[PDB]
């Protein structure tokens with residue numbers, strides 16, 4: 338089986354570990370977990386049936402049993418954890434956004450590349466059957482020549498502690514806009530924008546509150562998005578061309594419905610687990626299965642979120658938040 | 669009754685005349701119609717039961733029986749028709765967009781102002797019960813402090829002859845974006861934007877094809893919109909604040925449903941006429957009734973679309989299409 342080590346024990350790691358533990362046991366095994374102290378780790382390992390527990394990430398890196406490491410840490414803690422794993426020769430699936438700015442990304446990608454090791458950013462949305470069907474509709478030319486993409490993701494997350502935390506690199510862009518940028522990049526072939534324009538405001542805790550972005554893409558098509566940590570939005574994403582519109586319905590960041598020219602299609606989630614910390618958390622299986630296929634084919638990166646695109650998405654996000662003045666220590 | 673003269677006999681005038689002829693006869697009477705030749709006018713007057721017919725607009729202006737003139741002409745023909753009516757002392761309800769650029773608007777408004785005569789731009793959307801309810805929700809502070817507005821309107825109109833005509837000032841902005849700009853202006857108190865950013869492409873017939881616009885509004889709120897004459901869009905409009913979202917569902921330019929924080933409300937159209945040339949064409953009654961109330965109170969303009977706002981909407985639209993290079997003779 339693909340032998341997984343789980344790095345950090347917070348909410349996202351529960352979901353992921355839970356999902357992995359529903360997969361065929363000859364395909365995936367969770368063999369270790371690491372926390373910043375032994376008790377947090379041992380408690381996690383009992384709760385989730387993981388044979389080995391560690392009180393540092395460095396120990397999980399060095400475990401010769403682990404083949405791939407899932408980096409579930411908070412935003413500013415990804416880079417050092419990813420770097421430890423790559424140095425020790427582990428493949429890495431790293432939670433989103435991979436790093437807090439472009440240089441963190443470039444640095445992870447250069448390490449992976451130079452060690453000949455697999456690295457992927459866990460933009461789980463891309464592997465949903467509804468997103469795959471959207472790509473197919475684009476490939477088939479069903480919407481005609483493209484014209485415009487649109488995506489939005491906002492909620493009041495002001496009582497979600499880490500979502501509005503300057504020290505944890507929270508804010509609309511890094512929690513929610515990442516989904517918008519990836520959607521728009523996906524529909525326009527992962528191409529680099531020709532021009533970006535941004536408006537938004539800050540939130541009184543030191544992060545961005547609501548931000549809208551206009552991206553000029555090549556070939557005379559553009560997209561825009563709005564994200565927010567205070568204002569509910571429609572949370573859908575569409576792309577349109579001369580023959581019609583395709584739209585991922587709410588929740589667009591883990592979508593189960595695609596409407597293409599009025600025609601609805603539903604793509605049911607796996608039945609298990611229920612009671613995930615995050616809405617639709619069972620859809621994490623799609624990316625876990627994806628990591629195994631890439632590794633089985635000997636790929637050092639995913640064709641669906643290639644590292645050069647992770648770098649561009651990070652360029653875009655950082656340019657966006659710089660245009661409205663929002664900075665972190667790491668810059 | 670309020671005695672109406674109808675200027676021009678095309679599709680929009682049928683709808684409007686049809687609507688006026690469903691209203692209480694002690695409240696509204698259609699007493700004349702004018703076309704660019706007598707036969708077009710006489711045929712219209714038989715079809716619609718209008719006692720007097722004219723083969724020029726100048727003759728309808730000078731008719732002492734007409735109190736208010738409805739200017740239903742194509743975009744570039746509004747200004748001269750409005751000016752004739754004002755000179756002859758008629759109140760005027762002028763179809764949208766009032767003029768093709770800001771100067772045409774300024775010039776109509778200055779004439780009306782100086783003659784002490786009522787002028788209103790027929791932005792019919794504003795008088796729909798669903799839009800009025802949206803204003804009330806804004807006034808009541810139901811959504812919390814505002815953050816962002818969004819609106820979109822596109823369809824493939826490339827086989828609608830006048831919609832894509834350079835000579836008739838067609839294009840996405842002047843046919844469809846006008847609805848977006850007015851929606852966004854409405855939700856932000858008719859205030860003048862601090863900054864605008866535009867991306868879009870042209871259409872091979874000489875007009876704009878698809879255009880997205882970002883508008884920075886005061887008090888740290890912004891809106892954006894996308895309009896198109898080739899690409900179907902979701903055709904909804906929303907505004908959101910710290911406590912939730914309000915949204916006018918498709919068709920947003922003549923809306924009958926309002927969703928406010930998940931709660932749906934429907935506002936049925938008048939039962940008559942059916943078979944309007946344009947979708948939901950019966951909602952034109954709301955503005956006809958509005959014109960009569962203003963005139964009855966002796967108003968020289970509408971408090972709901974004040975002329976100073978018509979001027980700003982025209983400033984905005986012209987700035988938008990100049991940013992992407994689209995020009996008409998009149999500029």
Ligand SMILES: O=C1O[C@H]([C@H](O)CO)C(O)=C1O
Nearest residue numbers: 492494512590614615616617
């Ligand atoms: O629990 C949820 O997951 C999302 C996260 O914010 C995105 O990972 C959200 O807002 C939920 O309902």
Ligand SMILES: O=C1O[C@H]([C@H](O)CO)C(O)=C1O
Nearest residue numbers: 823825843921945946947948
């Ligand atoms: O007939 C219609 O009215 C609209 C117009 O384009 C707007 O007045 C539209 O696209 C229809 O369905």
